[PDB]
Design a protein around this ligand. Structure first.
Ligand SMILES: CCCCCCCCCCCCO[C@@H]1O[C@H](CO)[C@@H](O[C@H]2O[C@H](CO)[C@@H](O)[C@H](O)[C@H]2O)[C@H](O)[C@H]1O
Ligand SMILES: [Pt+2]
Ligand SMILES: [Pt+2]
Ligand SMILES: [Pt+2]
Ligand SMILES: [Pt+2]
Length: 435
């Protein structure tokens, strides 16, 4: 039937983290950076469509701190930051709370669809939320269409407009601002599309804008062919960004177009090991010196689509940087341990340049310098195969990151690079269905 085609789901999440970082300015001491244990739990109601045209979605989640070390920095992004609004962030605490993260009317008419309210991007644009356990929330609306041409392929495109955002670690929405936190950005919007040729070749691209400030670009080619009866997946991705403020002020981020280009190769060997080989290439001349996939520069103020994620702490998005990643996920099912997996991954990055200019350079600022970053991580995963708690997943991740330079964190004209690090994450994820 219609709106009593509804569903009600949710989950309970546990997160325990210990991360420390090298302090080059205090005798190379590795010091406590993050140390906490936090709970999350959510509830998600999604209606059917009445007359196949009208629906309602409502969802909320809560964070409840258990443990926190005194020397832990903030925000840890799992709890709520003590600062409700992103542009008020002052880095001094975390707290418990309840946040309404979905609150939307949804519509369907023919091949057309729309959502308006408290929403996440779901179509073809380059707007995106941050993801903790739960996603961030935009205030705005999205509309799109899907046109199926059978074997000829299928086309879909969509448009999203928004004027406020909250990251999953913020209890309230905030408006958008330039890099100075005071010049107003009236809205973010984005149009994008996707063509599926039905031959395992897919094209996607999208254009975005932050009103009066930034133009953002996305493009991705995907292909899947079989080698030895198993799919080898491949893709080239292009991410670019431009601003409209070239006057050497605090708001001028990029000289000329900034971009990140990526190549992707994936393959499952012997139906038992997931294999990843990926590389990225970044250009970011100007004052910032690193690429951002989001159209607002301030931390947590918005987010954009980025299909590249290596879970090795660094962003590897510095001005000249080139980087390579290999990861292996070994399914232990043939040791008769189905649902256990173990993995390791490794990143090496070189040719990392700093910003091309600085208004307040520091002692380490050398415009022609290049540095290298590297990292490796180990992974252990277990999903409960059956019983009362079938689906419950336990996860343990360890990362060691090395900077390869004596430059203290955030210094030397590398605004998005921190010092050497060892990070350990343990999470439990326990879904549930009410309807
Ligand atoms: C039934 C749902 C039960 C859970 C709701 C929990 C409260 O959820 C909370 O509502 C408050 C207050 O309106 C929202 O707050 C909202 O209104 C306030 C003004 O009062 C704005 O400053 C804020 O930016 C906006 O988000 C938070 O976004 C939301 O998380
Ligand atoms: Pt606290
Ligand atoms: Pt420009
Ligand atoms: Pt500029
Ligand atoms: Pt180092």
């Amino acid at each position: 039937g219609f709106i009593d085609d509804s569903t009600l789901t949710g989950g309970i999440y546990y997160w325990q983290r210990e991360r420390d970082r090298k302090d080059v300015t205090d005798g190379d001491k590795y010091k406590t950076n993050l140390s906490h244990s936090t709970w999350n739990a959510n509830l998600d109601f999604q209606s059917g469509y009445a007359a196949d045209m009208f629906g309602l979605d409502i969802a909320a989640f809560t964070a409840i701190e258990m443990a926190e070390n005194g020397d832990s920095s903030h925000p840890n992004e799992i709890a709520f930051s003590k600062s409700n609004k992103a542009y008020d962030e002052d880095w001094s605490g975390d707290k418990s709370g309840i946040s309404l993260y979905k609150a939307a009317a949804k519509f369907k008419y023919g091949p057309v669809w729309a959502r308006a309210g408290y929403i996440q991007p779901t179509g073809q644009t380059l707007l995106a939320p941050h993801w903790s356990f739960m996603p961030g929330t935009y205030q705005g609306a999205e509309a799109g269409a899907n046109f199926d041409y059978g074997d000829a392929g299928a086309l879909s495109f969509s448009y999203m407009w928004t004027n406020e955002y909250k990251a999953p670690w913020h209890l309230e929405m905030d408006e958008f601002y330039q890099n100075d936190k005071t010049t107003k950005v009236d809205y973010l919007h984005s149009f994008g599309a996707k063509y599926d040729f039905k031959n395992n070749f897919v094209l996607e691209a999208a254009f975005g804008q932050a009103e009066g400030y930034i133009d953002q670009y996305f493009a991705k080619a995907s292909y899947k062919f079989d080698i030895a009866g198993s799919p080898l997946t491949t893709s080239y991705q292009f991410y670019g960004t431009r601003d409209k403020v070239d006057d050497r002020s605090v708001n001028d981020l990029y000289d000329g177009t900034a971009w990140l280009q990526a190549l992707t190769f994936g393959y499952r060997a012997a139906d038992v090991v997931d294999l990843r080989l990926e590389g990225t290439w970044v250009k970011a001349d100007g004052q910032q010196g690193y690429f951002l996939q989001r159209m607002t520069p301030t931390y947590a103020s918005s987010n954009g689509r980025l299909d590249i994620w290596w879970d090795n702490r660094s962003d590897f998005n510095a001005n000249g940087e080139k980087a390579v990643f290999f990861g292996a996920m070994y399914d232990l099912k043939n040791w008769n341990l189905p649902g256990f997996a173990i993995g390791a991954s490794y990143v090496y990055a070189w040719d990392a340049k700093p910003a091309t200019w600085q208004s307040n350079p520091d002692a380490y600022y050398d415009k022609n310098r290049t540095i290298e970053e590297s990292a490796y991580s180990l992974d252990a995963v277990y999903t409960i195969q059956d019983g009362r708690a079938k689906g419950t997943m336990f996860k343990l991740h360890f990362t060691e990151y090395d900077n390869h330079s004596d430059i203290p964190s955030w210094g030397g004209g590398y605004g998005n690079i921190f010092q050497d690090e060892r990070d350990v994450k343990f999470m439990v994820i326990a879904p549930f269905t009410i309807f």
